[PDB]
Amino acid sequence: CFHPPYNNFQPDRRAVKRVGVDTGGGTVGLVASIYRDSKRKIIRDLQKQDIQYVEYGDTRTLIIPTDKYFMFSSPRLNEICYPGLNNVIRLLNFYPQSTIYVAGFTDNVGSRSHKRKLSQAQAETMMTFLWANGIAAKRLKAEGYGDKNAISDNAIIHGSAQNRRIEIQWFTS
Amino acid sequence: CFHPPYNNFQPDRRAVKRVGVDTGGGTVGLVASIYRDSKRKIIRDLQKQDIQYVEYGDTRTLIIPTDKYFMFSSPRLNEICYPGLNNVIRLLNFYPQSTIYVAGFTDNVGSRSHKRKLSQAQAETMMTFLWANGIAAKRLKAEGYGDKNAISDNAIIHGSAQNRRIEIQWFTS
Amino acid sequence: MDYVKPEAPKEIWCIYTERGWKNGIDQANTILEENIARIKEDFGGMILYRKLLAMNMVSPPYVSH
Amino acid sequence: MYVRTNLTILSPGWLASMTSADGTHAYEMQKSPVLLVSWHGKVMQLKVEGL
Amino acid sequence: TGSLAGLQMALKETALSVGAQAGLAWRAKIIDEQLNKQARNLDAIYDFNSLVLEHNILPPVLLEGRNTLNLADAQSIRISDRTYKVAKQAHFITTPPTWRQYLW
Amino acid sequence: DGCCSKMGGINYCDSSAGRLVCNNGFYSTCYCTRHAVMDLQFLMGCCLWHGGVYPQLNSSGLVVCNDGYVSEECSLQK
Amino acid sequence: VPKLPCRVDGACDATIIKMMTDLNKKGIKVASVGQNYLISIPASALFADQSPRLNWASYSLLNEIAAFLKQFRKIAITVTSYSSKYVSVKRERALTLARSRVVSEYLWSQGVDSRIIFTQGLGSDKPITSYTLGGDRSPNARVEITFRRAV
Amino acid sequence: MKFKKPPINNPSDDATIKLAEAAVSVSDSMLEM
Amino acid sequence: KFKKPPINNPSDDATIKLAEAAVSVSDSMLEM
Amino acid sequence: MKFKKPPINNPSDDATIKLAEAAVSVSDSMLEMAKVEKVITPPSKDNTLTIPNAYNLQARASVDWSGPIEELTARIAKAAHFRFRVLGKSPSVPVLISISTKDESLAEILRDIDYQAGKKASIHVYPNSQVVELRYAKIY
Amino acid sequence: KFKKPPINNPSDDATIKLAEAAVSVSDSMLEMAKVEKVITPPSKDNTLTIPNAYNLQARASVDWSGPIEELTARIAKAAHFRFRVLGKSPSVPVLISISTKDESLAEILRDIDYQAGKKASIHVYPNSQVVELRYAK
């Protein structure tokens, strides 16, 4: 079956469950499996949760809100939102040659050293979670920027909520 | 039969009365006897009177209120409450190897020497009552603490009533 | 803010009762905003005092016992 | 108002105060229908009628 | 009252006036019975007879306050550590006082 | 109504703590005097944190507190 | 009377008796002497084999215990963890401290209205039983939560 | 497994509560002097 | 066949405290 | 291809909006003035000298307290198995503290209390005698 | 099976902003207190240490609010010591206040020295069994 905290970092044998409830037809179980392990349904599942995906050229980017995937003002990872993290591992499993950059961003409230240190901690936590699921250490790099290059306006409430985020970029070659 | 003041410190032949009123059936008299000489009904009878029993690990403790088992402000033993004392002897008859500690506690009203002396007197009286029912002198020890380590709050009436007590601890080995 | 429960009480009655409801809500929000300004005044004035005492433009109070 | 208690009065501000040997406090203050007190690290309110 | 959907007596005082007196008298009786039951303990506790001075003089009554502060107005405060006051003065008596003039 | 339910019923009101005592030796959750520690955080009335309502009767609807502040909030509108 | 509260909120005597009875049948020991209360939990129902990692299903038990603790009024709680002897004194002192830290954090995350929570881990220093044959299955590897009911 | 705590006395009167509370303070003032 | 308790016995958790206070005050009186 | 932007939280109250807007301005005023005070008078000494640590000062605590200082310090000393001592006379206007932390050691709890006491009281720890000592200031 | 979220969690984009502002303000208070507070090193602290003689470990119970000389003389007499005074008593006497239920005489002496301040000092000689109160010039 499935162990809810990260399945002991083992790949879950997901397809056999569908082909067991459908043989308990084999062809219908194979069609349901080959639909849900495809890339577009995984992309739609990240769309169903609060994670944004942007593809432009051969550069791909994931945008993750710290509001739902971290506990408040800490580098601890929020354990109720494990389906999103498992879907991130499943999507990242499709590109086994590229290099990964993870970058952390906060808003403008507080002191500068505080913002930089919190960003660095959160980026390292997400990089460590990526490394512990099988990805080799030579493919990864984490960086924490402060309020360096924002994407919304910090003088309003919703845009300031949209500014606190984690960026994941990766190439193809 | 039964002599109400302590049966002249003799073990009362209790089972024969039940098997005489039931033969006057033998099997029903044996089932009633083997139920009421069991440990759980004796524990429930101390529960029916005002005596508390606590078991945790291999240490066992009896809590006795001086309010019902002593006369007021004296080391004299209250003779109307003899069923509870007989049940204490019956329960203590089951552990013939352990050593016994009896400790006495009062509340906070009065002088310190008065509290200590009254505690010491009450603990000795209960130890002497235990020794006179057959238990050897090398298995017993009595100590009287004052208001040393209370279990309730002394600034309120019911908790102060709950603080005046006798503690009996014993081991297994 | 101060609360006392008011227990002291049809073609076009509903719309104007509703408009009065909106007016009361807007008035309460305005009152709260002035209160916020007042607390900000007291705290900011004291904080500014600490900065000017540090930068040596005011004198401290002198006390005798 | 003259208030006799052994809690600690925090908010409305008193004019004079005395203490006994066992820890009872006595306060003289201006009239107000509410008092803010600290019990054991917890802030709460006491309600005064009859004013 | 409430929301948009929510918006969209002489026997009274005669009942209170007969209830207050009956409750007061009944509780007064019960208080007196409890006082009369415990009459020897209160005599042992409030033993005025063994506080009397040499020529049958009742001792004076003194009051104590500790850790005193007064904020007289803005710009002035006065503090003290202890204060002692003579509330009542000594005098001759013929009989000692008893608890019954206070508690009954 | 039922204070000491699944216990023996009400024994008495302990006024030193302001609580009822059940017929086993447990303190109840019910209060029995007004000088008990209740955790009051929400109070009604107006001119709180001032002196209360200055009790003159006014021709207009203004409500004035005992320290000169005027409650515009409890005042009736025109 | 209609506007004063009539009891401490969210609390009922039948609910206290019901939950205490259910916890004692499940196996968590709940005891009361005077006004002091003790809850004793075996370590096997909470942790893995001597690691400070909770199972996913034991959070229901911690939720049940938090729902019990919200029924009272209190000032301080103490959580202490004890284990059994494996390698040295230091390894289980660190283990018990980590276990108590995690458990008291989840209890503080839920809404227990205490002013102080103290946490300590004593290692394998104070055994309540001379039978030391189990590992983490032993009855003397446990966590104990003690408090005093205030007024 | 009915839970019970040992001292269960007769019911008390609040006058006796107040008198007892006054008497304890009289007694330890007396002790000190 | 029968024993009775004392007729004025402090069978009340407020009365008990009252009687203890009454004992200690008179003890202090003998010492003074 | 439904379009969505990531932070979708619960709805907000405009009172909380106004409160947040006031709090941000208070916060950077505090930050700027604290920078100025640090620049003007640089501190030289640390209270690790007066409060060193020991074994069984490493038990941990999480605390929410809003009262006078003395009872809380007594609770910490009792949890640390130390004797508690008071020097000087308590003032008539009480010394109030306010601590709201989560999971820190008892030595740091005492050091934070020592910093909040300011010019009114001080904390000293003697580990060889196992004594926590709180002394009041000779003011008034 | 179940892992609920924290009950008072900032799950609101205005409430969030309020809580970090509350974090940063308290950070600034700790910084200001650390700059402003003055301490003394434990080497040069002018307070009389505990003299650890055998006679000064006896327990006592003292209520006093008055002059320093009488109380120190009684403490010395209770410890079977001698007592001597060096200096001149001022016009306004030095007033202390001691209220304890259970305390040893050495720390009572330590509190006497702390409360005396700069005007007087207490010295203990344990070989020649004496305590000495020295005034300030």
Author numbering:
A (entry chain CL), B (entry chain DL): 42 to 65, 88 to 236
C (entry chain CC): 153 to 161, 173 to 228
D (entry chain DH): 311 to 361
E (entry chain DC): 28 to 35, 57 to 152
F (entry chain CN): 39 to 116
G (entry chain CK): 38 to 188
H (entry chain DD): 23 to 55
I (entry chain Dd): 24 to 55
What do the study's own words say?
Legionella pneumophila is an opportunistic pathogen that causes the potentially fatal pneumonia known as Legionnaires’ disease. The pathology associated with infection depends on bacterial delivery of effector proteins into the host via the membrane spanning Dot/Icm type IV secretion system (T4SS). The Dot/Icm complex of L. pneumophila is one of the largest known T4SSs. The Dot/Icm T4SS has as many as 300 protein substrates, a striking contrast to the H. pylori Cag and B. pertussis Ptl T4SSs, each of which transports only one virulence factor.
We have determined a 3.8 Å asymmetric reconstruction (C1) of the Dot/Icm T4SS using single particle cryo-EM approaches. This resolution made it possible to trace connections between the OMC, which contains 13 copies of the asymmetric unit, and the PR, which contains 18 copies of the asymmetric unit. Unexpectedly, we observed five peptide chains originating from the PR, with attached densities sandwiched between the PR and OMC. The models that were generated from the 2.8 Å resolution, symmetry-imposed reconstructions of the OMC and PR were fit into the 3.8 Å map of the Dot/Icm T4SS that was generated without the imposition of symmetry. First, we observe 13 linkers between the OMC and PR (identified as residues 264–270 of DotH) in various conformations, revealing the direct connections between the two regions. Second, we observed five small globular folds located between the OMC and PR. These folds consist of two β-sheets and incorporate the linker from DotH as an additional β-strand in one of the two sheets. Close inspection clearly showed that these domains contain folds nearly identical to that of the C-terminal domain of DotH in the OMC (residues 278–360). Thus, there are 18 copies of DotH in the entire structure with all 18 NTDs comprising the PR, 13 of the associated CTDs extending up to build part of the OMC disk, and the other five CTDs extending up only part way into the intervening space.
